[PDB]
């Protein structure tokens, strides 16, 4: 076909994609910064395309409604033909692989526990076995789906609590989960992807931390519509950028090099 | 096509695939045990196939000869049409993805440093900057290729040393690298995949250990010939087994649950 | 035939099927939780069907009226063609096997004695031989039928008392039997299935307990209309879920893991 | 069809079917005694048939050879058309239900641990975590198959040990397992069905006992060839005999009433 600008669906999620502080004065791709903004530029260079970053309209990662069977979020933008690629912290999952394609992972992660510092919790088993400290997840996305589907005893128990907890333990965005941890005086802990957890503990006011091991092991991938020819080049680009050390450099840049909570 | 037994290429590498102690009395797939033997059985169950485990004839993972352009090892078994699938600790790399297909990773790893306990080395930078302690890699495979291609300063320096070191610092198998570490009185350190390193430090005589962080981040995948229809089902099976927690259970079984070097 | 949503008849009985506390806000299968809700989801996954949980309209397990010969309850929903399957604590009995099909048991049980703690009763023989403490059963279902038909001396004696006792010793639901035990100051004991008894002694206020051995040994099965093709797949699914350990995990989840009356 | 004597396949296993002490002087069904001999007589009475008890020629319960796919044992007698019914302690399992029919259970059981008294083992986890005391199973049958197929962590670990243990930990008959426990001075424990374990601890010299809970929960059923019309009547007979209390009376007769190791 003719040359075409690639439509990239992505999501505002720190430090992957963020509005620049002066974004109102800026246009197009220049409005945004972060790990995935940098990654998109490198992928585009290696694959020889021009592109337009487009924040997903509904602010969602992607889930399939049980009733209507409609996908929302970034996954929906791909499935319904709006976007050519998703470059975001989009988790590779079985249900998604059935409907979209993913590159090999550009970053590893697992579900993890964020506490306000001093909360007496060390593990998922600890959380699951006490009744003083509430806990929840992002309200839509792979973390929620993981818990809803899991028959692993501890995680099934956690889901059975979370889905009925009152007031609701689910949040709309990571920033809301973090704020809830920070404001709840040790009485809320947040289950979130380790990559986000590990970012936030590097930010002021340095009052949150990861505790325990991860609950699972997975990866983020660059996604394309199922069968799109673009998937092959993008996958090879991810593998090249990984081997060359660029992914590690970008991770250090956006997570650690300017951390506000010390070193080591 | 007709029903067919799937030919699985694999490699003897502990604890992935090992001869059972009584293997001489046993036949077929029953001769073998380990993480990848267990994984193969689960993949086959989920994908509805019968299979035959076949140890790669040349004992190699897979590399492309610079002159003849011929692939050896497990990669060669796939490329030349001998095997239908590889179920092994086979690293997903760019050069390989161009010629075979890989599932999403079933295990994460990075290149790492093994020392005999007490060796005064803490990092790759340490190794690279001293001249008393020799170091090398497995003689063919992704670790060697990583170093040969790398322009990351420390790793380029290491390769430039290793490729000319005398006597040769390269070994034919992980077990030979481990034996060399154990017998060289602190004067040899071994660069190997973290998964193997972390296994060996759980085995008697408990005289080796991993030191430092990993040098890179990658994954092992289940490989199929390029464009084989079997790749789709096998990938979905890996994702399912991961989500269900089976991969983690197999890792704990073969690495840690019977560790001979303590707990914690 | 065409794809079809399976109609599942079931019954509100803790902890098998319960209304979620926020059920008024919820729709369809999401309204409900418990052991049989979890089991239904697993059976459906293994057998490849979609389903609709439907609480039996008359709140009954199933009995055949002596005069009209009409079946009520869940058994009636199956016999009269309203439901495709019953997934509930439905006891496998001879009279029922003549009119519906059952899977092999998914749970074992026997009739048992519940007392308010401190009641001086240790056995059925004890109950049968004194006249201070009244006792009864659920007013319709397999427990009542067991006593009505039994020629075992102790149980015949008990039935001969219960059927004429004034005020009536029969109750409409397990919760009513439990409340009667709790409110009757040791002057009522309740004969009920051991599985329910063992659940209730794990709940606050921890004032009831099982005493003695069970009076009989039987099982709950997944029921289908007689000769329905669905019975074969559902039976194989029950056997698979049993062997895999899932039934035991669900039992522990709903009976013991969150018990409110201590451990051990 | 014409009237016909039913061929019953069964197995010598105490106290289910045993040779009478004076069996050499006796003919036909009169040679044998035990729980299943008594049960066979009751089933035949209720179903209106004459029958011939026939001890399975190979002394096996039933397993399918991985290579030839041939069934041996009692299962084989049914599958290959030699016997009309199996009346024995034959465990209902998924793989068997695919090829033969089973009544609802006439007895419940689970895999369990037999020790020589004083052996410091309390649980499967204990057995699995030590290396001084060997343990095994009957060499063919549902117990062995359970361990071979299980992905439950503790049981997978146990299987991985047992299948390679030297000398072999497997035995040909329960009596051989019991003798090995008795003669091995606390250095062998035996994994066997709870019903057999509970029988043997009631026999002199009263030097063995069950320890711990059961590892699983299952049942024995009366088996018929798949689709045989005899299955319906036999199932209804089992349910009737259960409800009437006859199964419990037979269990007490053969296990406990003449126990040689005390009461209570
Ligand atoms: N990456 C997830 C979205 N997502 C993000 C998070 F920060 C988190 O904690 N959980 C989650 O599901 C997805 O792709 O759905
Ligand atoms: N996984 C590698 C082979 N392989 C194995 C090792 F144990 C190691 O240290 N290095 C390596 O290259 C490949 O696929 O080539
Ligand atoms: N399971 C029974 C119903 N049912 C329930 C009980 F909790 C009980 O104590 N008795 C009883 O008959 C049936 O299927 O009829
Ligand atoms: N009941 C089993 C046979 N069987 C008997 C035993 F006594 C025992 O311990 N294990 C076992 O498998 C079967 O049907 O295979
Ligand atoms: Na990290
Ligand atoms: Na690790
Ligand atoms: Na119990
Ligand atoms: Na018992």
Residue numbers in the entry:
A (entry chain A), B (entry chain A), C (entry chain A), D (entry chain A): 1 to 264
Passage from the reporting paper:
Here, we present the crystal structure of the soluble GluA2 LBD bound to the partial agonist 5-fluorowillardiine (FW) in a different tetrameric arrangement, which we could confirm with functional trapping in full-length receptors. In this arrangement, subunits B and D are found in close apposition, distinct from previously published structures. Screening across ∼200 conditions of mutants and different agonists, we obtained a crystal of the sLBD in complex with FW that diffracted to 1.23 Å resolution. The asymmetric unit harbours one molecule with density for residues Gly1 to Gly264 and a well-defined positive difference electron density for FW as seen from the ligand-free calculated omit-map. This allowed us to position the FW with occupancy of one and a B-factor of 7.0 (compared with a mean B-factor of protein atoms within 4 Å of 6.9) indicating that the site was saturated with ligand. Within the crystal packing each FW-bound sLBD (sLBD_FW) forms a back-to-back active dimer with a symmetry mate, which further builds up into a physiologically plausible tetramer. Intact D1 interfaces indicate that the structure is not related to desensitization. According to our sLBD_FW crystal structure, the parallel shift of the dimers allows subunits B and D to approach to a surprisingly close extent. Furthermore, we compared the extent of trapping from short (30 ms) to long time application (10 s) of Zn2+, obtaining a further reduction in the active fraction of only 10% after 3 s of application, indicating that the reaction was already practically saturated after short intervals. These striking results show that the sLBD_FW structure represents a unique arrangement of the LBDs, one that is available exclusively to partial agonists. Our crystal structure of the soluble LBD in complex with FW (sLBD_FW) shares similarities with the full-length structures, like an intact D1 interface and a stabilized interface between subunits A&B and C&D, which was confirmed by cross linking experiments.
At synapses throughout the nervous system, activation of AMPARs (α-amino-3-hydroxy-5-methyl-4-isoxazolepropionate receptors) plays an essential role in complex thought, as well as processes such as learning, memory formation and brain development. AMPARs assemble of four subunits, each comprising a large extracellular amino-terminal domain (ATD) a ligand binding domain (LBD) that is connected to the ion channel forming transmembrane domain (TMD) and a carboxyl-terminal domain (CTD). Glutamate released from the presynaptic terminal binds to the LBD of postsynaptic AMPARs, causing rearrangements that result in ion-channel opening and transduction of electrical signals. The LBD has a bi-lobate fold, built up by an upper D1 and a lower D2 domain, with the ligand bound between the two lobes.
